[PDB]
Ligand binder design. Structure first.
Ligand code: 402
Ligand code: SF4
Ligand code: SF4
Ligand code: SF4
Ligand code: SF4
Ligand code: FES
Ligand SMILES: [Mg+2]
Ligand SMILES: [Mg+2]
Length: 575
């Protein structure tokens, strides 16, 4: 094929779109509604408009290149078309970037600046209450910012296949939202926040917990613990112009101390706990020849998916609490026993790459004697915002260490944030538990990677067992519906709602689609975790000294008695 673009001749054999071919050859073509290899089929944004000689104006993002095409990407007609579309978007957009949470990384603002577009008449809604939905424990909608680009709908479709995010006809105009415009929590929505990640503007956000945290910090009698998820140390640096794949653990500890948190712990400790319980439970099921399979339960998105689509699997879920909740429980029980603090004055805050964690933390039964396991959950973005608001020079901070009591962790706990990490850690402990030995080779590279469905045959003590890692909610649906679950007998199955694992969580920093083309964000974020695992002395959860001390001195033997009674949570289906 011979393609003429802006007077430049190309000879190619590729069968692709104008947009992709142009961007492969460093030709600038703007785009908005195009993301995840699809656009808004109904109301195309037409920001990707180009001029094809003989045909007229076309959308580059969904138009294949053809031999003889003469394309102009920067003609006056094209620019006036694009500018017109952007102006029409501005007509329904509250253009107040000042207090906006996407001010520093908004795509729409970049487009407005680029094409110098102005609204025909500024959209200044006086009461935004009709435009805002904050009923959810995880997600919030601000339709004064919504461009109706459909990116959240497509992302929900491709990531979860639930289509919990839909186009709706409200009042006679189109909005996006949950089924029947209900609160997302009350639908089949997983609260995974992939829709947020896909959003180019501030229309979709996480349910803020920053005020809980601030009020707790400023409350004289409250002792505020903070603990960050595995993924946070591999991600937040992005929001401080430090680049991708940068380990910023120590800087985070320092920043948290400067924020005024009273205790600095780590969720990876909780991960080691979860492994302590779950590996024990797995060995128990192995020696009892059942029941099989056992599913992980640490992902609240997956838990909600099971609740809403496969309740019969609820009794197959591990009873071990997630690292977050198990850490919280221990923070309300064990921690006061080694600190002298009044448990009621303890306020436990987690930092998560996840929006669903907010819902998990606010589950009614996630408490004991009137004390919440977790009192607040802030996302990576929220923590970054809190750091910036405090004018803390994050990139220049010196490394500090976490408080040891519930802050030490192994590499096994460290790799939790990546798909297949929980599986690998769990196997590392379970083999040692079952064989009553301390094995050398602990790396299970078969369960790693971005493959949607991963399988492995592991040999434990005498026999062989089948494990599966489900990478993404849509892949859970595929795994179940295709009957892959019935092809063989599975014994242990990991499920993560977000493809790539928690490193690609709904509470993670937004990334420019261009940088998304430049960088494999999932592998790069996971690389930090695996690198931490490689260079750590202890690489098994049961080799965690602080954790071993905690079990020996307080909880006793895992998987039973005190440990089972306090550190476990069971989901029950309804009759
Ligand atoms: N609880 C918990 Fe987890 C741990 O440890 C996080 O904190 Fe994850 C991450 N990163 C998130 O959110 S949840 C799913 N299990 C894998 S990792
Ligand atoms: S969504 Fe973007 S363009 Fe709209 S107010 Fe916020 S920063 Fe400005
Ligand atoms: S919420 Fe965001 S992603 Fe969804 S249609 Fe509106 S602007 Fe697009
Ligand atoms: S939170 Fe997840 S399941 Fe719910 S609408 Fe958004 S992408 Fe879909
Ligand atoms: S994979 Fe991780 S970030 Fe995504 S919903 Fe599950 S726990 Fe949250
Ligand atoms: S980016 Fe092509 S129609 Fe929206
Ligand atoms: Mg299309
Ligand atoms: Mg305080």
């Amino acid at each position: 094929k011979t393609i003429i673009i802006n007077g430049v001749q190309f000879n190619t054999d590729e069968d692709t779109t104008i947009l992709k071919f142009a961007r492969d050859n460093n030709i600038d073509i703007s785009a908005l509604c195009f993301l995840n290899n699809c656009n808004n089929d109904i109301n195309k944004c037409e920001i990707c408009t180009v001029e094809v000689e003989g045909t007229g104006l076309v959308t580059a993002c969904d138009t294949l290149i053809e031999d003889g095409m003469i394309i102009n990407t920067n003609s006056d007609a094209v620019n006036e078309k694009i500018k017109s579309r952007i102006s029409q978007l501005l007509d329904i957009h509250e253009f107040k970037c000042g207090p906006c949470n996407r001010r520093e990384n908004c795509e729409f603002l970049k487009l407005v600046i680029k094409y110098k577009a102005r609204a025909s008449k500024p959209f200044l809604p006086k009461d935004k209450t009709e435009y805002v939905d904050e009923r959810s424990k995880s997600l919030t909608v601000d339709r004064t910012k919504c461009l109706l680009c459909g990116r959240c709908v497509n992302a929900c479709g491709k990531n979860t296949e639930t289509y919990a995010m839909k186009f709706l006809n409200k009042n006679g105009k189109t909005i996006i939202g949950a089924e029947d415009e209900k609160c997302f929590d009350d639908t089949n929505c997983l609260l995974c926040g992939q829709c947020i990640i896909a959003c180019p503007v501030a229309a979709l956000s996480e349910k803020s917990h920053m005020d809980r945290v601030k009020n707790a910090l400023n409350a004289p009698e409250k002792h505020v613990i903070v603990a960050m998820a595995p993924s946070v140390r591999a991600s937040i640096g992005e929001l401080f112009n430090m680049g991708f794949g940068v380990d910023v653990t120590g800087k985070i500890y320092t920043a948290l101390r400067q924020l005024g948190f009273d205790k600095i712990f780590d969720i990876n400790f909780g991960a080691d706990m979860t492994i302590m319980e779950e590996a024990t439970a797995l060995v128990q099921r192995i020696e009892n020849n059942g029941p099989f399979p056992m599913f992980t339960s640490c992902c609240p998105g997956w838990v909600r998916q099971a609740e809403n689509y496969y309740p019969e699997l609820l009794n197959n879920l591990s009873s071990a609490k997630s690292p977050q909740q198990i850490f919280g429980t221990a923070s309300k029980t064990y921690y006061p026993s080694i600190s002298g603090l009044d448990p009621k004055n303890v306020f436990t805050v987690t930092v998560m790459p996840c929006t669903s964690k907010k819902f998990e933390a606010d589950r009614p039964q996630m408490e004991k004697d009137g004390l919440r396991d977790i009192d607040a959950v802030i996302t990576t973005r929220e923590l970054a915002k809190m750091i910036k608001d405090a004018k803390i020079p994050f990139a220049k901070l010196e490394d500090s260490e976490a408080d040891p009591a519930m802050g030490e962790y192994s590499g096994a706990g460290a790799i939790f944030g990546a798909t297949g990490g929980v599986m690998e850690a769990a196997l590392r402990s379970a083999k040692d538990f079952a064989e009553n030995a301390e094995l050398e080779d602990i790396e299970y590279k078969q369960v790693r990677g971005l493959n949607g469905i991963k399988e492995a045959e592991v040999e434990i003590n005498n026999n062989k067992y089948n494990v599966a890692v489900i990478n993404g909610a849509s892949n859970l649906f595929k795994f179940m519906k295709s009957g892959m679950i019935n092809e063989k007998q599975y014994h242990f199955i990991e499920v993560m709602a977000c493809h790539g694992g928690c490193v690609n969580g709904g509470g993670q920093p937004h990334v420019n689609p261009k940088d998304l083309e430049k960088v494999d964000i999932k592998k790069v974020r996971a690389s930090v975790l695996y690198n931490q695992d490689e260079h750590l002395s202890k690489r098994k959860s049961h080799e965690n000294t602080a954790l071993v001390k905690m079990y020996q001195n307080y909880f006793g033997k895992p998987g039973e008695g005190r440990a089972h009674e306090i550190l476990h949570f069971k989901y029950k289906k309804s009759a």
